């Protein structure tokens, strides 16, 4: 089946789910408004992305690059599904991993010369304006990878977007601020499996 | 009304967004309830069940065949609670096929004095569970409760509602997650709607 | 053929305190014998062996209740995972039997059991199934005991070959208890007396 | 007080042919040493131990990259499962650091963020224990409320300076192991089991 896709499209008027339908951390009981993307649905979509990734990139050594901090959950789960494929199939390919954090200035990570001649998969939590990815791609290409692709859990529909589109997309979401599944608000809500929308009292509670 | 409400106009998801068995590729129309969503809802139901029933030995009764997946997953989440909490209760299990006649379980004297949890895939008219409940009460359980993954909004309902509900769904035929169409589609993780060519292929 | 993961007669098992155990069985178990996760790892490999050997024709998976139900559910979950992530897939239907089967005729029948001890139950079961004209019959058993009481029957797929010891857990019961336990374990003296029939 | 699951010096591990293994590592591994699922079962219990000791106050969970990233993700998943199914839970924030040779810390938030917090350092393996002593000495300059260390693996080795972590998955022989994000020259991180490398594998992937 097809490997390029705009992702699961979540509409502008998506109501999400009452928190009382799900198991939610107690300490965030009053801080969230709605569950927006259930953890399980993220897992289902990520399973299919892993297959799409192996189809496009499985022909040569893959370097999977995790963009910290918010990419870490998507990265771990995506790679677990890729590993499941590679131990149950006829063919497989080695995969190495690295981690970078952005200040854009690139923090941590291996020497980027280790990307040379490899199939590089950049893994991100969200594309909003896309400026971060564009600057990051422009960097990585200078090391002459055999290919560079971007997997992003979330892509926002926003008038501030520039036209950048990643190669693999989990969900295309409206222009709302979401948290959970490692996406934070002032470092909070990373310890939440679902993607959710913050309540005004949660926004006020954890404001810097 | 107390479960996850899926509306009549729910469009579901394109098959191409998910991992789908090849042999059902032409036979399904849409994914209706993704497997992971069933899991998330089932996690919360497990907790609801322990809260109401965990005071006394539980006998969990799986209604075959369609009940088997929900049953195994619900009980896994209940086990996960019980091995990570301060207190828990023994649970024993039995399996039946469907006085209403009950095929293949233990003597129903095993229910006497127990907290009995009946586990179904779906409630539609509600007659099956009404009839099964009428029989079960005669064995004097301590309590009897029903958990159903799905409940249909149907005008043919006799007004029976279960105690625990995963999803309230439209009056549409669904398959997947052990729900079949002529024994097919049980080997599918998601709840889905069958395509026209799918109906024709597997028609009995 | 694979004989399964061989568990030695002297296998010490694991201290219960190193694992998550349901509180209601804390005094009733002696040791963890096969951790639940190891069961999953082995079952994942068996699912692949099953699909390589049987995946050419429609499969009917037949669960032997009650004890086979956890192994059955997990094994079929791993086979479904294979079937939705490969080019090669085959329809599977399911049925249950407790110790009509028109569900079996002309299909590749996979019988799923918790444990083979003497093998007499399985030989009797196999004799019945053959009468429904299946295309193929194979048997997957989570556990096979090493025992001189055996009549020589060996399943096609085996998870673990274990000593002649009474085990519980992962749907293996003692007077219907311990089915609600993820690990395979050995029962304590307290447990044997408490749940004795 | 638990020394962890003790894996003895003579334990033979498991035939590779009994598990699902990526084919690109088929000749490169000798035996499966600790099956992925056993790691999961042990990690579940650790998460409960951690919540019992640390759950009274906001936890900052510190991942020591790269090798600790799998243990870290899984351990936090089990802690999240406790927190969404209990009445009692506490927030957790996270941070990631890399250590580079003594050692300096790379990446990370300002260590001031650790002041007054319950700090949980998550590591893949303790061998001599010098790395953890170093990281602890740094962390302790910022006066955390408490600091604890969870390590998946601890080696039995004469070279130990005597440091013992607070939570331990497995106590293993002095053998070089790979898998579950532990590497040999960056390979084998993409393997779910912990395994011992073959002589072939050592020669194939040698720097
Ligand atoms: N929790 C949340 N975070 C969001 C959201 N939209 C954007 N963002 C991002 C906020 N960001 C960060 O906090 C970066 C550091 P972190 O990964 O958490 O350690 C980056 C924003 O992501 C988009 C890219 O910057 P760009 O595409 O270049 O515009 C959102 O709806 N929820
Ligand atoms: N796959 C599907 N099955 C459905 C559907 N609605 C009803 N049913 C059920 C058809 N049924 C069976 O096939 C029973 C045997 P099985 O569980 O498959 O081994 C029973 C129906 O469930 C509802 C009860 O009968 P009742 O509440 O008394 O009306 C549906 O939308 N999809
Ligand atoms: N919990 C345990 N059960 C065991 C054990 N060894 C045998 N058995 C079996 C006892 N059995 C049952 O309880 C059958 C009913 P159930 O599946 O629990 O609904 C059958 C025994 O399995 C072996 C076959 O009989 P056979 O190969 O013909 O000798 C054991 O070490 N632990
Ligand atoms: N794959 C493996 N790695 C090992 C093993 N014993 C040690 N080590 C470690 C080698 N190390 C690294 O490769 C650090 C970089 P990374 O986390 O992989 O990005 C550090 C060693 O861990 C122990 C500490 O150094 P210390 O307690 O201070 O002696 C082993 O049996 N297998
Ligand atoms: Mg990001
Ligand atoms: Mg952020
Ligand atoms: Mg039913
Ligand atoms: Mg049916
Ligand atoms: Mg049996
Ligand atoms: Mg029995
Ligand atoms: Mg380390
Ligand atoms: Mg290393």
Main sheet summary of chain A: 7 strands, mixed
CATH fold group of chain A: Rossmann fold
Number of domains of chain A: 1
Structural class of chain A: alpha/beta
- How many E strands of chain A? 10
What is the CATH domain class of chain A?
Alpha Beta
Beta content of chain A: 25-35%
Largest protein-protein interface: A-D, 39 and 40 residues
Strand order of the largest sheet of chain A: 1-8-7-6-3-4-5
Give the N-to-C terminal Cα separation of chain A: 46 Å
Number of DSSP helices of chain A? Answer: 4
PDB class: transferase/inhibitor
Keywords: inhibitor, nucleoside phosphonate, malaria, phosphoribosyltransferase, transferase, TRANSFERASE-INHIBITOR complex
Assembly: tetrameric
Entry title: Human hypoxanthine guanine phosphoribosyltransferase in complex with [3R,4R]-4-guanin-9-yl-3-((R)-2-hydroxy-2-phosphonoethyl)oxy-1-N-(phosphonopropionyl)pyrrolidine
What's this, in brief?
Four copies of one chain form a homotetramer. Chain A has 208 residues and is an alpha/beta fold.
Provide a descriptive summary of the structure in words.
Four copies of one chain form a homotetramer. With 208 residues, chain A is of the alpha/beta class. Chain A has one domain (1-208): 3-Layer(aba) Sandwich (Rossmann fold), CATH 3.40.50.2020. Chain A contains four helices and ten strands. Chain A has helices spanning 39-57, 72-86, 131-140, 200-205; strands at residues 8-9, 32-37, 62-68, 95-102, 106-107, 119-127, 147-156, 168-173, 178-179, 195-198. In chain A, the strands form two sheets. Chain A has a seven-stranded mixed β-sheet with strand order 1-8-7-6-3-4-5, with helices on both faces. In chain A, helix 2 links the parallel strand 3 and strand 4. In chain A, helix 1 (39-57) crosses helix 2 (72-86). The radius of gyration of chain A is 17 Å and the shape is globular. In chain A, 55% of the residues are buried. Chains in contact: A-B, A-C, A-D, B-C, B-D, C-D. The A-D interface holds A 23-28, 68-69, 72-73, 76, 79-80, 82-83, 86-99, 101, 107-108, 182, 187-188, 190-193 and D 20-25, 63, 65-66, 69-70, 73, 76-77, 79-80, 83-96, 98, 106-107, 181, 186-187, 189-192. The structure holds ligand WPG (4 copies) and magnesium ion (8 copies). One magnesium ion (MG) is lined by residues 67, 173 of chain C. The PDB classes it as transferase/inhibitor. Keywords: enzyme, inhibitor, nucleoside phosphonate, purine salvage, malaria, phosphoribosyltransferase, transferase, TRANSFERASE-INHIBITOR complex. The assembly is tetrameric. Human hypoxanthine guanine phosphoribosyltransferase in complex with [3R,4R]-4-guanin-9-yl-3-((R)-2-hydroxy-2-phosphonoethyl)oxy-1-N-(phosphonopropionyl)pyrrolidine.
């Amino acid at each position: 089946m097809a490997t390029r896709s705009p992702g699961v499209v979540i509409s502008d008027d998506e109501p999400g789910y009452d928190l009382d339908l799900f198991a939610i951390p107690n300490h965030y009981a009053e801080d969230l408004e709605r569950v927006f993307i259930p953890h399980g649905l993220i897992m289902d979509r990520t399973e299919r992305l892993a297959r799409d990734v192996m189809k496009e990139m499985g022909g040569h050594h893959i370097v999977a690059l995790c963009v910290l901090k918010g990419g870490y959950k998507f990265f771990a789960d995506l790679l677990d599904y890729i590993k499941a494929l590679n131990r149950n199939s006829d063919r497989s390919i080695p995969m190495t991993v690295d981690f970078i954090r952005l200040k854009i200035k690139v923090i941590g990570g291996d020497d980027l010369s280790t990307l040379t001649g490899k199939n590089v998969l950049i893994v991100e939590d969200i594309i909003d304006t896309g400026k971060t990815m564009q600057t990051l791609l422009s960097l990585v290409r200078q090391y002459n990878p055999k290919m560079v692709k971007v997997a992003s859990l979330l892509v926002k529909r926003t008038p501030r977007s520039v036209g950048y589109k990643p190669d693999f997309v989990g969900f295309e979401i409206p222009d709302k601020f979401v948290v959970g599944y490692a996406l934070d608000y002032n470092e909070y809500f990373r310890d939440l499996n679902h993607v959710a929308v913050i309540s005004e009292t949660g926004k006020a509670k954890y404001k810097a």
